[PDB]
């Protein structure tokens, strides 16, 4: 609603744009370069004018409310085909080819 | 002139076999100059079936040695090369 989500205050611009969930850190360094907003000032000190140009960039990359939708179909395409990358992805095993006998605990919990 | 061998009880004992046997024939040959030495360490395991922390490490050396003529007018050392090579000395010629 503010830029797609709420944006914190009393912070620099590149840090503030990070919470938009679809722009990391290197991408938000291009947006202040392409628009011209100084990151060295806070978001409080800005004008209420050029935020549309920041909002123009949000309408060109992705939005987290639909980013998580479309990335699920990338998962969902892998599951319903029954390919090996979606075979373990149904179950909960690691995917990229890690070791399974021990230590793969961030995909199985405590 | 440059010389390569494996032990200093040959290669630094064959320069006098060249310095004396060339300065005798008139031409001036200056004092030989040492070079840095090749050193290669080989750590090998020693037990047939395994016990890792028992090891043994060797080293193979290579001594270098460079001569320097002043006036080339002697083919005397060109015939006396089979004399100056004895067992393990290799001589590449740089007749300066």
């Amino acid at each position: 609603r503010i830029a797609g989500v709420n944006i914190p205050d009393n912070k620099h611009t590149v840090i503030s744009l990070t919470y938009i969930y679809g722009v990391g850190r290197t991408t938000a360094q291009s947006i202040c370069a392409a628009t011209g907003v100084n990151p060295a000032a806070k978001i409080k000190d800005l004008s209420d004018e050029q935020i549309d140009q920041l909002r123009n960039e949000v309408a060109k990359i992705t939005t987290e409310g639909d980013l998580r939708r479309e990335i699920n179909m990338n998962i969902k395409r892998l599951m319903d085909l029954g390919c090996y990358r979606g075979l373990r992805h149904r179950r909960g095993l690691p995917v990229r080819g890690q070791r399974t006998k021990t230590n793969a605990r961030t995909r199985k919990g405590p | 002139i440059r010389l390569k061998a494996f032990d200093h009880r040959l290669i630094d004992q064959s320069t006098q076999e060249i310095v004396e046997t060339a300065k005798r024939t008139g031409a001036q040959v200056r004092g030989p100059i040492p070079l840095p030495t090749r050193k290669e360490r080989f750590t090998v395991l020693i037990s047939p079936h395994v016990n890792k922390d028992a090891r043994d490490q060797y080293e193979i050396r290579t001594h270098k040695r460079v001569l320097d003529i002043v006036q080339p007018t002697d083919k005397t050392v060109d015939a006396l090369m089979k004399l100056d090579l004895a067992a393990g000395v290799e001589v590449q010629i740089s007749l300066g």
Binding site: - | F42, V44, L45, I46, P48, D56, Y58, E59, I60, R61
Partner: protein, 98 residues
Amino acid sequence: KESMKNRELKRQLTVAKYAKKRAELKAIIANPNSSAEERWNAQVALQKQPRDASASRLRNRCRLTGRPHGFYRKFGLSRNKLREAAMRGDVPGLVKAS
């Protein structure tokens, strides 16, 4: 084994037999100025050769013993035949040091 040295002897023949066409077939593909029609038929000549011609199929074993692991290429010996042949003064220029 002895039957296992013998099957990896003839791999060294078949690599060193052909050895020149596969340089040419990899000279064609590696050029950015090469045409893909000249590349695609060059792909045909690689896979129809017997696969025991690449160097990656070749395995440098010990020459006197045959043991795969523990091989050095500044010698031709194994890990444990090199020790027995060096203590008998054979290998020239090789001593212990610190």
